[PDB]
């Protein structure tokens, strides 16, 4: 039975000529209940998804046909679930994915009729798909429009919501051993990556180690080590803007029945029949992601405490279990920079302890408030105009680096370390940084499209130059050598080309002129300052899953609150 | 003696043959505690496939105590996640006999009977500092 | 017959698969003995690691000599019993070139180097380490030279015996 358009139509008018649709019901029941037939069915003249949509349009108006579809999907699903696992077919048949892109066109998947037993079974059968098949399917889905991605999103959001509402989840019955929610979210991962795909880079350098480096010399792992629990369905395909906003995947009914105390366990030690809902972190709320990061960064503190206990045991050494600063209140930068420099030199992995920062001249037990006080003191004194490190756009109330700040490289490293320690041990600050800062931290340079946050008064001028329909060569005569004036009154004419002051702008050169001017404004003017800033930020949170759990858009929420 | 950067013997038997000696007639200094190593310690350093560490042109071994101690320190400090043997096989697209998995306390590479003992007993291989480690039967 | 280890400008070194001391294993490696035990006409996995990628045209050359001082002066000839493989080249690799010296007549198995985390070359040995007329229980050193002219060298003793399981354990326990 090689179904096509013509077989379905011929059976359809044969049914309506006898005024009874029993042949269509029996055909649809016996063909859509077999995995072998749909793989060879509906092939192009290797599958005509538009023609499947046409068949569904011309067919799904009858209730008997659609309930036959439901029961046939119920029959189809478990014999494919126990086929990808106990056997393997996609390796010997690339056509097998046809099965999963003919039943997905069913508009009644996004309906309560398929919610109870059809869709859980189908998403369980699809959850065990091999990684290459998942990559091909995500690549296929990425070309779909926004409404179809929203439909595939809500198809599994409905199932997760229904299976969370309908199932009572105490601490003894978790969401990790409920295969319906696990399969639905592991199939929603495909829709999330299809949204990512269908919707400029930094130069990272890591930090060394003192004693473990000699061990790395011993084992021979000295060239370059690897780091990151990064997902399996990546490096099969490709940071960018999505087709549907990333907040839409945040499943709120699931996020209030999770247990990150137990979920972090299955994230750091991989139990077989227990899914860890940070492998799919896009369904994690802000409080849930922050909770998981908090558990990770407290387990690291306990590991460093145990390391110092061992050093107390064998060698007899006495080591401080905290990052015990001692800053005089009259000089916070001058007395925190030197301590952080000393600790960064002698023991680079000592900044991954609990921060204890007490002031001289006063005795305080650090229950958390004293570290907080140190933090607003730092944010006050770093961001003041007297130190001359950050300028303050009052039209947007945003703090952006100074292109004319020199010999403060250590202090930019200090504020980077302040943000790193802030994220590390659960501290919230008041930093008014543009989002280009929170992306340039993660490893992505800033594009002209994000000059609207940092410098809006100049971004508007650049955009008005971009779509200016008249000839730009004879109207403003702006050269490639830009005209920027320092706060000192001196000009700081910067060069974007070898003959910038001799090459006039043209109606074609403006497109790259804008994207070199933006590059100079927010990548090259502040290159030393941000290099120091990002090194300071990285040296505290280099072993953290923050690049894995937290998107750049949801890190301003982590520091600023 | 071996102050040349790109001329020096990396492991113990190469060090023995370029020093006109044997593995039975060598005295070696631990790179951590700067103490001499006994016969069983240079034998274990040979069996564990550990590189000779060169400081100021002098070749250095590691005794048992410093090896186990700093391996434990690095286990605490740089642990990433524990994966199953079957998960490792399906992830790396290679059998466990084609992957380098060292012991987690003594850094002896695992013979395939030890990896099969991990697979049969449903134990996990731990990622420490980007390298996979298990547990040999000597340390289990 | 220069067996001296040379990491080279690119950090050339040799790795091997710790294939255990099984009764049924065909090839095994011992780092203490630095010996690659093997079975006649079976797989020999030798991994090549470099710190930096050499320029293309890099020649991984395998040359077998004798380990003993008095025996380095004459070449490892193929066993007269076996004289698709040529009857003169001992080490086999499973496009590959083969060279013989013009004065001392040494068989060098030359393969163009290919980047991958380790270039795993499969070698094969065709006579036993107890053949008559050839080795006659003479230990052999296989030298793997990453040379384009040298950019790196390493070496390892080789035994080709009846079973690489019993003799590896026996030799390691005679060492200890
Ligand atoms: Zn020692
Ligand atoms: Zn061990
Ligand atoms: Zn022979």
Author numbering:
A (entry chain R): 126 to 170, 233 to 386, 394 to 432, 439 to 761
B (entry chain A): 8 to 147
C (entry chain B): 98 to 180, 188 to 198, 202 to 223, 228 to 259, 263 to 290
What did the study's authors say about this model?
In this work, we advance the understanding of this complex by solving the cryoEM structure of the full-length 16E6, E6AP, and the p53core domain at ~3.3 Å resolution. To aid in structural studies, we adjusted the linker between MBP and 16E6 to be more rigid than the one used in SPR experiments. We modeled the 16E6, E6AP, and p53core structures into the electron density, revealing a ‘Y’-like conformation, with E6AP and p53core flanking HPV16 E6 with the individual 16E6 and p53 proteins superimposing well onto previous structures. The interaction interface between 16E6 and E6AP is significantly larger in the ternary complex compared to the 939 Å2 LXXLL peptide interface which expanded to approximately 2,361 Å2, or ~2.5-times larger, contributing approximately −13.23 kcal/mol binding energy. Approximately 65% of the E6AP primary amino acid sequence of E6AP spanning from T126–G761 was resolved. The C-terminal lobe of the HECT domain (residues G761–Y852), which is essential for E6AP’s enzymatic function, was not resolved in our structure. Although 16E6 and E6AP form a contiguous interface, we divided the interaction interface into three segments, labeled site 1, site 2, and site 3. Site 1 is composed of E6AP residues, E403 to D426, including the reported E6AP LXXLL motif (residues E406–E415); however, in our structure, the LXXLL motif is protracted to encompass E395 and E431 which extends from, and is perpendicular to, the 16E6 hydrophobic groove. The site 2 interface is formed between the α-helical linker between the N- and C-terminal 16E6 lobes and the E6AP α-helix between residues S503–Q515. The site 3 interface occurs between the C-terminal lobe of 16E6 and a β-strand directly after the α-helical linker connecting the N- and C-terminal lobes which form multiple van der Waals and hydrogen bonding interactions.
